[PDB]
C-alpha cells in the first residue's frame, strides 16, 4: 500500500533503507545508475538514472509510474569532493551542492503534489554529523554547507506542506560502515580520532540507521516533523 | 521480556507511553501516587510513590522486585509552578527542578546498575519545546531551565553508559492534550498565538507522542542515544 | 591599518557595518552596483558591481587594489524571491542560493590568501533568524535553506583558516528596519505575528546589528570563531 | 557610571571581565571569599563572600550598597565535582548544581530590580562547550547538566526582562588556562584528544575570553539578548 521512492538504494545507507521499507510491506523502487542488481535482490522496482545530470522531475514522473503512487521519498544519493576550500574549485562546489541539496528540492517538490493529493507523505532527507559540525579531521567544506543546508530546507518544506499531511525531516547519522566513507576507515589519523569520540565505540551498521529511517517513513512520525534526528552512537553529546 | 518503569504512568503522555510498552510485549510498572485504577486497566503493575517527597532510589528497588529485572525507564511524573522569575519563591523554584531534573538523575542513577547487568537498556526523560525555547506567552522560567537542562543530562548519562548497551534520549513533546497543559488551552492569548505557530495546525493527542517514545525504548535506538527528538507538529521549525 | 571590504555597503545593515569599520579606523570599500553616492557620504572607497552576475574573485582582486590590502571581508549583498517551493522555479532557487551561499563561499575562498599573508583575517557572513527557524508566517523556503547553509560554510571555513589568523562567523540579525524587510512591515499578518515574539518589543536599527558586527570584525573575535552570533532582540529565545 | 558585581572576580575569567569592565569606566565590585588582595590590584570592591553558604540575597544588597547603583551582574564563581554519574552522591550533584544554577537564578532574581529601576541592565551567566556537548574524555555530569540549564535561564530570563531594559546572555568559553582546567592540562588522555579538536591550535588566555564578555556588558549588546555567545578558538565547529 505505501509507495516509495528512495535514490541512492542499491549500496549502503539507502540500500538499507530500501530493504526496511520492503520490510514494512511498501511497494519500493530504487534508483541509482545500474540499480538493477540490488532491485532483483531488493524486491524493488529498479529505475535507472545519473541524478548528477537527469532532470529530477522525470525520475518522480517515473516512480509514479512505476509504483503506481508516490507516498515516500528518501534521497540517499551520494557523492562528495574531500578537499579543502582553497583548493576547492567552483566546479566541484557545486557538483556537491547539487547532488546533495538542489536535487533534494527539485526531487520534494516533484513529489509533494503526490503525497498530497494521497493525503499522507513522507519525505526523508539524510543529513549527517556535519549538519552540526565540520567533520574534524576531514576536508569536506562543500558536504558540511550541503549537509547543513538541508535541515533549513527540511524546516522550510516541512512548515509549507504540514497541512497536506507531509512530514519532513532531516535523518543524521553518524559514522557509518559504508563504501563511501572507506577513505576515512583507511586512514588512522581520521578513523581513530573520529572513533574516540564515538562514546559506543564503534561505527554503525547501515541497517541500524535504517531502523530509524523506516520509523521517519511510516505512522510513528505522525506528528514529527521539520526536525533533524541524529543516529550518531553518541558523538555528538561527547 | 523487557521490563519497563514509567513515572506519571496514570495520566496523559506517560499514561500513553506505558500503553505502547504493553502493546509492544514489555512487562510495565507505573508509579504516580494513586496508580491503582490506572494500572489495572493499563495491565501493568502499580507502585504508589509521591516523587516529590519519597526517595527515587526506593521506587527503582520496588520497581525491580515487582517485574523481576529493569530494562527500561521513562521518567514522564509532571508538576509547575507557572510565576514569572520575579515571582517565583525559591521553594517553589527547587520544587519544580528537583522533580523534573534531580529526581531524572536519581532515577537513572538508581536503574543503570540493572540495565548494564542486563547489557542493555534504555533511559527516556521528557524534555519540551522550552528545552529550545522560553515557552513563548507563558510564564514558566524554572520548567523552561529544568527540561533545557535534561538535555545536558541525557548527553552526560548517554556518554557515560553507553558502553554498558544503555541508550539515553530526550523525547521532547511539543503541545499536548493532557491535563497538565489546560491552563494554556483555556486562556486565548495563549493558545492562540502558540498554536498559529503549529505547522500542522492541531496539538498532539499523547497517543501520538507515544509512537515515538516507544521507539526510543526499543531496538530501533540501538545507534541512538544522548539526543532530543522533538515531537511537536513542525513547531520548532516554524 | 586593517582593510574592509564590506558588500552590500551602500543600504542597511551592510551600510551600517561600513560605517561602524570606518569609526574603528578601518579603510573600508563598499560593493554594490551603484555605491558612489554612499561610499562618498561614508568616506569610503566605491567598488561598482553586480554580484549576481560578476566574478566575486574580480572584485576581491578590485579590492586589495583599491585598498592596499585585505583584512576582513563582510557580505551583506542581499537578494530574495519571497515564493512558496511549490511555486518556485529552479530558477529563483539558485537565485537566491547564489548570491547568499555560493557568492559568500567564492568571496570568502578569494580573500583568504590576503589575510593569511597579513597573519590576521576576519570572514563576517550574515545570517537570520532562518539560519535556525523557517521564517514564520513567511514564505521564504530558498532563503531559509541559504542562511541555514552559511553556518555550515561558516564552520567549514573557520575550521580550515584558523591557524592562518582567520575568524570566520555568521552574524544572525532579527528583525531589522531596512529596505528588504519592508513587504514584512507593510503585511500586518505578517508584522504582528512576528513582533509579538521579540521580548523587546520591537525591530532593530541596522546601527544596533552593525555593533556587534564590528566585534567580529575585530580583536575581540580572537577566541571566537566557527560561530553564529544571533542579534534578534529576544526573537529565537522567545 | 555603569555599576558591576562580578562573583569569581579574584581569579581566572572572572577576574579578566572585571579587569575588562574597569577598563570601560565601570565601577566593579568583585565577591569571592577573599577578594580583598585582586580587588586592590584590580581597583574593585571587595566584597567577601562564600556563594555556597551564603544568602546570594544579601550580595546583591551589599554591592548596591557598596556601588551606589547595580546594572551589571557576572556570575563566575566556580566549583565542580569531577565524577561520573555512577559514583557521585546526590550531595556533590546538588553541590554542583547550587553554586552554577541556582545562585545564578538567585543573584539575577535579586539583581533585575536595581537594573530595571535604572532601565539598562546586564546579566552575563558563564557557560561553556559542556552547555553543547557532554565534556569529552572528562567526567563532568553534574557540571554539564548545570551550564546546559543556564541556556534555559538565560532564554527564559531573557524572554522576561527585555521590555525591562535588561540583556541576560551566557558566554561560554571554550578551554581556558585557568587554575580551575588545571586537572585537564595536566592529563595527557585529557589534554591532547581535546585540544587536537580546537582548530586554533591552542588553549584561551582569560583575557581573550574577557573581550567578549565587556561586550555583552555594554551597549553592543543592546538588541542582544537570550543568547549563548561560544568564544572557543572553534572547538564546537570543527
Ligand atoms: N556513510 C556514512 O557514514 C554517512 C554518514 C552520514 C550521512 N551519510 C549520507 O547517507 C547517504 C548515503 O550514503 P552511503 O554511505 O550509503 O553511500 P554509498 O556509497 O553506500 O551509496 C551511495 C548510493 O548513491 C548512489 N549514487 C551515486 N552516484 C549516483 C548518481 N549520479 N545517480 C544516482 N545514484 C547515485 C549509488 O549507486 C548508491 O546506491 C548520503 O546522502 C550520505 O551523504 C552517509
Ligand atoms: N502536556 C504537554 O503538552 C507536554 C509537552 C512537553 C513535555 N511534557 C512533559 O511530559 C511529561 C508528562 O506530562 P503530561 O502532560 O502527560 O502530564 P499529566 O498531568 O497528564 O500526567 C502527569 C503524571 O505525573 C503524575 N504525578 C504528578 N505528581 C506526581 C508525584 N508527586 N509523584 C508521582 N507521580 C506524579 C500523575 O499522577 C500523572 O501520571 C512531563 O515530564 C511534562 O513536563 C508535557
Ligand atoms: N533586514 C533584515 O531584517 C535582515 C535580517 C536578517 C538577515 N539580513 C541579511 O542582512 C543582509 C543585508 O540586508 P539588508 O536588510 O541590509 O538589505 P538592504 O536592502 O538594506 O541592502 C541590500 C545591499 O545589497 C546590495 N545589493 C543588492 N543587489 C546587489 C547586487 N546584485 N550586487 C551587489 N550589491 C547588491 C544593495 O545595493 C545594498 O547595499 C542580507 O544578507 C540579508 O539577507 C537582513
Ligand atoms: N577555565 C575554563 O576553561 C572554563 C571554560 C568554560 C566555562 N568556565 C566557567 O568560567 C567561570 C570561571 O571559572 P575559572 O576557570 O575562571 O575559575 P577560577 O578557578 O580561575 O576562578 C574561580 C572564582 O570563583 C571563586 N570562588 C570559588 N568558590 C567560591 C565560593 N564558594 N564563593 C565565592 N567565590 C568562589 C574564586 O575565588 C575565583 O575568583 C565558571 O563559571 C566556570 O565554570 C571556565
Not at 107 to 132: C, D, K, N, Y
Not at 189 to 216: F, N, Q
Request: net charge neutral; charged share 20%; hydrophobic share 45%.
Amino acid at each position: 500500500e505505501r509507495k516509495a521512492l528512495v535514490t541512492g538504494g542499491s549500496r549502503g545507507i539507502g540500500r538499507a533503507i530500501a530493504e526496511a521499507l520492503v520490510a514494512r510491506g511498501y511497494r519500493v523502487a530504487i534508483a541509482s545508475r545500474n540499480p538493477e542488481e540490488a532491485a532483483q535482490s531488493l524486491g524493488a522496482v529498479p529505475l535507472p538514472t545519473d541524478l548528477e545530470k537527469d532532470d529530477p522531475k522525470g525520475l518522480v514522473k517515473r516512480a509514479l509510474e512505476a509504483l503506481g503512487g508516490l507516498h515516500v521519498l528518501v534521497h540517499a544519493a551520494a557523492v562528495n569532493v574531500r578537499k579543502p576550500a582553497l583548493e576547492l574549485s567552483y566546479e566541484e562546489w557545486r557538483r556537491v551542492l547539487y547532488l546533495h541539496l538542489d536535487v533534494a528540492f527539485l526531487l520534494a517538490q516533484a513529489a509533494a503534489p503526490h503525497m498530497a493529493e494521497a493525503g499522507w507523505g513522507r519525505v526523508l532527507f539524510i543529513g549527517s554529523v556535519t549538519t552540526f559540525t565540520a567533520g574534524g579531521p576531514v576536508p569536506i567544506p562543500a558536504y558540511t554547507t550541503a549537509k547543513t543546508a538541508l535541515l533549513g530546507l527540511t524546516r522550510a518544506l516541512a512548515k509549507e506542506w504540514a497541512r497536506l499531511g507531509i512530514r519532513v525531516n532531516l535523518l543524521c547519522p553518524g559514522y557509518v560502515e559504508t563504501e563511501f566513507t572507506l577513505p576515512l576507515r583507511q586512514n588512522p589519523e581520521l578513523y581513530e580520532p573520529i572513533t574516540a569520540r564515538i562514546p559506543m565505540g564503534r561505527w554503525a551498521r547501515p541497517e541500524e540507521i535504517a531502523r530509524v529511517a523506516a520509523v521517519l517513513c511510516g505512522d510513528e512520525a505522525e506528528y514529527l516533523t521539520g526536525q533533524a534526528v541524529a543516529v550518531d552512537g553518541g558523538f555528538l553529546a561527547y
